Amino acid sequence: VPAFLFSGSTLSSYRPNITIALPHYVDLPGRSNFKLMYIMGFPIDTEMEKDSEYSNKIRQESKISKTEGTVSYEQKITVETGQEKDGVKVYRVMVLEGTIAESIEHLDKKENEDILNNNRNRIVLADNTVINFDNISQLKEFLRRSVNIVDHDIFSSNGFAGFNPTSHFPSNPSSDYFNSTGVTFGSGVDLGQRSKQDLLNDGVPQYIADRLDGYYMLRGKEAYDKVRTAPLTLSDNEAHLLSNIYIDKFSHKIEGLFNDANIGLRFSDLPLRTRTALVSIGYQKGFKLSRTAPTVWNKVIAKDWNGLVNAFNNIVDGMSDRRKREGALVQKDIDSGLLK
């Protein structure tokens, strides 16, 4: 105390392979100053101000908010638990350069609870700066906010894209979009232009894709009649699975457009709520925002965030309340210090 040692286990893609009872000292092959000591087979990371051969210098702190902030969903993270005293830091390594996903799982694992509630929990980023968390919870939250390209609960709420597990038919005869509309499930998933094999190719499970037989490729009057005389309802679990697959898929196209514009930063460097606002407007008006919502896009590529809020507020499509709610997501990111 204050510690645990051989408690639980550790996730690493890196192991080196005749007396092992003695400690072994290793240099992380990719980077530095990152030097680890293996007691038994377990990785230990220590920092000491006064020069040591096998220790590391003091890592500077990160300015990222531990409360409201995120790390890029694109990067790798090192998760550490331990103690620090008067200029000397001792930490046990839990995840060694892992993705946010297995981090979030291997971090709740049955063997690992014990050491994480009595020791200080931090993340070491790819740039070798440090985020110190007050507790383990804060950390878990942080990982959950970081893992997803958009916020799925916000996106599927009635305020934005909605959720309807029964087969439905937006628009109508009086509309220009009549003939371009298909049968739709979950949050806006439209089968009008899709084949079963397309869904299988996108990663949708067999049982869901077979369940939808007879609804593929229908549009206009056909789709309207089909919904009227022979509806089909998916369970909430299946509907949410299908939806999340197509939401992530679309998010990637928005991401590509953003990165291709060479604005000075990457889509993954923006806060969660803003990413969510941009994907939402694109989902409804079409993905190429340079063409479909020019005022919004022009403000985005200028990096003018107040201008962006105004643009969301001034657009007239007859979808006004939703446009406003998107703008208010952006305004929330400005007010909390995450933007600019």
Identify whether the C-beta of residue 205 lies closer than 8 Å to the C-beta of residue 241: yes
What CATH number corresponds to the domain at position 188?
1.10.530.40
Structural domains of the chain, count: 2
Q: Are residues 166 and 243 in the same domain?
A: yes
Q: Are residues 143 and 171 in the same domain?
A: no
**Do 264 and 320 have their domain in common?**
yes
Residue that finishes a domain, picked among 106, 123, 147 = 147
Domain co-membership, 301 together with 192: yes
Angle at 266 between CA 263 and CA 271, to 5 degrees: 110
Q: In the chain, at which residue ranges do the beta strands (DSSP E only) sit?
A: 24-27, 35-39, 42-48, 77-85, 88-98, 120-124, 130-133, 164-168, 184-186, 189-190
Residue that finishes a domain, picked among 116, 147, 178 = 147
* Residue 133 shares a structural domain with residue 60: yes
Range of the domain at 321: 148-340
**Do residue 323 and residue 198 come from a single domain?**
yes
The residues, any chain, with a CB within 8 Å of residue 188's CB and separated by 6 or more, are 161, 162, 246, 283
Instruction: Yes or no: say if 89 and 46 are a contact pair by the CB < 8 Å rule.
Output: yes
Bridge partners of 269, per DSSP, are none
Looking at the fold, whether 187 and 326 belong to one and the same domain comes out as: yes
DSSP bridge partners of 25: 37
Which experimental approach was used here? X-ray
**To what resolution in angstroms was this structure determined?**
2.3
Distance CA 250, CA 264 (A): 23
Are 181 and 171 within 8 A, CB to CB? yes
| 277-312 burial code (b ≥16 CB/10 A, e <16) | bbbbbbbbbeeebeeebeebbebbeeeebeebbebb
CB 277 within 8 A of CB 312: yes
Q: Indicate if 130 and 78 belong to the same structural domain.
A: yes
Neighbours of 194 (CB within 10 A): 17
Separation of alpha carbons 238 and 174, rounded Å: 32
Pair 181, 76 in one domain: no
Q: Are residues 133 and 154 in the same domain?
A: no
Q: At 157, is the secondary structure helix, strand, or coil? A: coil
Strand order of the sheet with strand 88-98?
Answer: 24-27, 35-39, 42-48, 88-98, 77-85, 120-124, 130-133
My answer on whether 118 and 174 are in the same domain is: no
Q: Are 279 and 155 in contact (CB under 8 A)?
A: yes
Distance CA 84, CA 90 (A): 6
Is the domain of 133 the same as that of 189?
Answer: no
Q: At what angle do helices 305-314 and 294-302 cross, to 10 degrees?
A: 170
Structure tokens at 169: 């038919």
Contact 56, 78 (CB under 8 A): no
Of 131, 147, 163, which residue sits at a domain end?
147
Q: By the 8 A CB rule, do 218 and 226 touch?
A: yes
Contact (CB, 8 A) for 40 and 6? yes
